[PDB]
Amino acid sequence: FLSNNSMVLYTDVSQWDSSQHNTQPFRKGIIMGLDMLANMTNDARVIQTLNLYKQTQINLMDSYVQIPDGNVIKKIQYGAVASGEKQTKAANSIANLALIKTVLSRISNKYSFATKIIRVDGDDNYAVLQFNTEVTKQMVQDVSN
Amino acid sequence: VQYEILQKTIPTFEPKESILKKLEDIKPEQVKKQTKLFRIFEPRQLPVYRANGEKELRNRWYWKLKRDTLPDGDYDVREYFLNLYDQVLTEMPDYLLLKDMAVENKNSRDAGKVVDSETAAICDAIFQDEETEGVVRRFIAEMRQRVQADRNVVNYPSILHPIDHAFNEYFLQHQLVEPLNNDIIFNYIPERIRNDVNYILNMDRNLPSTARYIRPNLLQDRLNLHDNFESLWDTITTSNYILARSVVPDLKELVSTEAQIQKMSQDLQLEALTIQSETQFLTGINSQAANDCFKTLIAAMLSQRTMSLDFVTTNYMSLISGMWLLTVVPNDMFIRESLVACQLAIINTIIYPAFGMQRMHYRNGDPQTPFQIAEQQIQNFQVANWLHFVNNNQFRQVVIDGVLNQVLNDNIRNGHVVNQLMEALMQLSRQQFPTMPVDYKRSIQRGILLLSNRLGQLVDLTRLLAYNYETLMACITMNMQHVQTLTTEKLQLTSVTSLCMLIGNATVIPSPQTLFHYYNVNVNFHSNYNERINDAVAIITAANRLNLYQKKMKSIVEDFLKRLQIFDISRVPDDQMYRLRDRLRLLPVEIRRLDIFNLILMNMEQIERASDKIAQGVIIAYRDMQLERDEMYGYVNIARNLDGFQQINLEELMRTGDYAQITNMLLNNQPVALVGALPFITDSSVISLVAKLDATVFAQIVKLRKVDTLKPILYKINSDSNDFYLVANYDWVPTSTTKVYKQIPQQFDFRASMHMLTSNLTFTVYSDLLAFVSADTVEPINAVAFDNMRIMNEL
Amino acid sequence: MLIGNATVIPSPQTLFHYYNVNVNFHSNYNERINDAVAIITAANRLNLY
C-alpha cells in the first residue's frame, strides 16, 4: 500500500523495557483478562493454571535485580519487563500493538486517514496509512511531531 | 557478605477491575431476623413552667427524637428522609419471633416480660420517679405477656411512639414466611421431573407444621433485556451457556477409536500412492470432541446462544454430517453466513452434481439460503421433502409452568427425521454423476454409506439429545428468548463427525443432583434479579416523589448491576444506565416498599416539626406581636399556623438567586414570612428582648446576599432567665417582632403509648429446600422417552 | 458518543471580556476609518496631488 497518497510511520521500540507503560498497566491488563477467563471456564486444572500465571504476573510487578559492582552487590527496584521469559515476545507484541492503536487514534483529531496495516516484531514496528488526498512535506512533518 | 540498595517510586495505576462471579458462585441470600424494634423517638424529662412563666416543683415527660441530625435546607431534609427509607429497608425484617428480644419487667405483679430493653428501661424509670401518679404504676404492674400455645401465638407489651408502632406493626403483619410440609417440597420440584419415570424420589423426614419457608420471587424479566440491550444480553447468555456446559453429561463407553477407524479404513479402501479426498474424512475423529459437540449443542440450545461453523471443504464428511446437524438442530440457532456457506458446499458437491446440474450461481446477500432455492429446482420427492423439513425446522415457543420454552418439533424428538435423511442419502447413492468422474462418485457414495451404516445409532443419538435437552430445560426459571447474540461459539463439524461416528448403546441421563443444582442456581440468580429490580425501582420512585432534582440516577443503576454479579460495570456507559432507568421508572413497586414509603411520606413532616436544631420558617412582622405561653418553654416567640403573612420560599431563592424581592421587602419594612429549614439560638435573656435583637439578624442579607448565615432568635423566658423580676412585678405580657415558625413537643402518655404486639411462637426456617429429597435413576439402558418407548435401543 | 449530565455555560467574566474586545475592535475600526477619510479629503481639498 505504498503510494503517493500513503505514508508509513516506523519506530524503534527496543528501549521500551524500563518504560512506564510496561510496568503496572501492562501486567494488570493480563491479570484482568485472566480473571475473565477464569469466570469463562468450569474445569479446575485450567483455573489453577490461570491463577499461577496470574500470580506470576503479580510477582513480576515487583522485581529486584542482582547486579554486582566489584565486591558488593546492588539490588534495584525494577518493576518492568525484559527478556528471559516464555512470555516476553508475544506480550511485547501485544502491548506495542495496543499502544500504537491507542496513539494512532489521536492523529485522527487532526487528519483523515485509513489504517491499512500494522506490524510489530520485537525491536521495531511499522504502520502504513492512506489519505483522502496526496501527500506533502508538511503533513509528514506534522504527523511525525 | 555485603549488599547495596536502590529504589524507585513507581506510580500506582489502579484499574476499576469490576469484581465478578459466576452463577454457581452466587450466594442465595441470608434472611433478616429482627433486632430491636426500630425506634425514632424516646421520652425525656423536661422542666415545666406555669403561666406567668415561673416554674413548678414538677417535671414532665415529652417525646423527643433520637439522634437529632436534620439538615439546613429543605432539599437536604428530603435527602434525610430518602436515607431513612433506605435504612428502614435495610432493617425491614423477613421473620421475627418476639420472645428472642423480650426481657423481664422488674416491677410486674405476675413477674412478666415485655418486648424490648428500652421498654423496660422506660417502665423502670417511670416507676421509680417520685412525681408519677400511682395509676401509671398500677398500669406497669398489670402489663405482662400472654401466651396461647394452641395457636402458637404470643402477645407482648410494648411502649413506643405511634410512628414506631406503625412501622413495627407493618413488619409483623407482613413477614414473608409460609408453612412448610413435604407436599411443598414436592411441588417446589418441577412437574416434568416428577412426571418422569426415569427418576425416583423419596425422603426420610416428616416436617411439622411448625416449620416455615420463604418463597422465591420467580417473577419474569420486567425489563426486556433481550429488547435493545444486546451487550448485556450477550453477557447473560454466555454466563448461562457456561453453566449449562457444567451439567451436560459426559458420554459413557464409546466404541474403540482405533477399532472404528481401522474399520473405516477398510470400508474406504485407501491407497498409499494417491491423495484420496476420502483420507480427509479421518481428520479429527477423536473422542473429547464428540463430548464437546454433545455439550455445545445442548448448552447453546438451552442458553439461546448462537453458534457458528468452521469446516474445510476438502473434507466432505464434515458436510455429510452437517446434513444431520442442520436437520436435528434449527437453522436460526446458527448464524446465517456460516450455514449459508455449509449449505452451498453441500449443494455444490453432493446434490447438484448428483442430479446432473450446473454448479450454482449464488449471490452473497441472496434473500434465500441455498436449501430454499434448491428445494424447488430438484425433482425428487425424498431429497426435496428433506430440504423442505430443513428449511421449515424451527423452534416452537410455548409457555409451560410459567417459563417460556423453545421446544423441538416432536418429530425430531422421536428420531424419525433421520429416516427422511437416510432415504435422501440412498436416493443420492443411486444417482450417477453425468458430469463428474467415477472416482468422485465413489468418494461421495462411500462417505454417505459410512453414515447410512449408522441408522440406529443416529436415531438413538437424536432421541438422546432431545431427551437431555428437554430434561435440562425443565430446570429453568428465566424465560428463554430466541434472539441472535453479538457473538458465537465455534462448532467444528469434525466434532460432529466424531459424535455421529463414535456412539452406541450406552445412555447418559442427567443425575438428579445436577438437575437440582442447575435449578437452584437459576432460582438464586432470578430471585436476586427480581429483588434488586424492586430495590432500585423503590429508590427511583422515592426520589421522584420528593423533587430531589439535583440527584443523578447513575450510582443506583451501578449498584443494581454490581449486585448482578456477572457484568462489567466499570465499562458499561452512561446512556445505557439511563435507558435502564427509563425502563425501571415505569415498573410497579412491591407492596412492602410502597407501604413503608407511604408511611414515611405521611409522617416525615411530623418528624421534622420536632428536631429542635432547625425551625420551619420565620415570620417578620414590623408590629409588636405577643409571645405565646407554653409549659416546656415559658413565654416564647413561637408560631405554628403561619396564617396572614405572605411567604417566600428559600430553596427557590437559592436556586435562582434573585434577591430583588427579599431586598425590597426588607428595606421598606414590609411584613413577610421566610419558609425553609433554619437553625436558631435560644436567647434565654430578657434584656435582649426589650433591646429587640431578633430583628437585627436580617440586615446582613442585603449586604451579603447569601441567606445561609441566617439564624433567628427564640425568646424562651421563665424563672431561669436572670431578669424575671420584671415579668413578675411590672405586669407586662412580653411582646416581640419576628416570631419563629415551629411546633412544640408532644406530651408523653404512658397509658395510650402502650400497645400489645402479637406474633407467633417458636417456628423454624429452612432454606436449602431440596436437601430433604433423595433421588436416583433407573438403569440408563432401561430408560424411556416421551413416547413411552426405550431410547437408545436400535443396534 | 462522549457527553452527558454536565452543563457548561460561559462565565459572566468571559461574556464581558468577549463583549469588550468586540467593542474595542469595532470602535477602532470606525475611528481609523474617520481618520483616513479626513486625511484623504484634506489632501484632495488642499490640492495635494
List keywords for this structure.
part of a larger assembly; 3 chains; A: 145 residues; alpha+beta; three-stranded antiparallel sheet; two-stranded antiparallel sheet; 4 helices; B: 795 residues; alpha/beta; three-stranded mixed sheet; 27 helices; 26 strands; elongated; viral protein/transferase; Rotavirus; RNA-dependent RNA polymerase; VP1; VP2
Helix-strand layout with pairing:
The structure is cut from a larger assembly and holds 1 copy of chain A (145 residues) and 2 copies of chain B.
Chain A: E1 6-11, H1 24-38, H2 44-60, E2 64-69, E3 72-77, H3 88-103, E4 113-120, E5 125-131, H4 137-144
Antiparallel strand pairs in A: 1-5, 2-3, 4-5
Chain B: E1 3-6, E2 41-49, E3 55-65, H1 74-91, H2 98-101, E4 103-104, E5 113-114, H3 117-128, H4 134-142, E6 146-148, E7 153-159, H5 162-173, E8 178-179, H6 182-188, H7 191-194, E9 199-202, E10 211-213, H8 230-245, H9 257-268, H10 290-303, E11 307-310, H11 316-328, H12 336-351, H13 370-377, H14 381-391, E12 396-400, E13 403-407, H15 417-429, H16 438-452, H17 455-473, E14 489-492, H18 493-501, H19 512-544, H20 555-563, H21 574-585, H22 591-609, E15 614-620, E16 628-629, E17 635-636, E18 638-639, E19 647-649, H23 651-655, H24 660-667, E20 672-679, E21 681-682, H25 687-690, H26 700-703, E22 713-714, H27 725-729, E23 740-741, E24 754-760, E25 764-766, E26 774-777
Parallel strand pairs in B: 10-25, 11-14, 18-23, 19-20, 21-22
Antiparallel strand pairs in B: 2-3, 4-5, 6-7, 7-24, 8-10, 9-26, 12-13, 15-20, 16-17
Helix pairs in contact in B: 1-22, 8-10, 10-17, 10-18, 11-12, 11-16, 11-18, 13-14, 14-15, 15-16, 15-17, 19-20
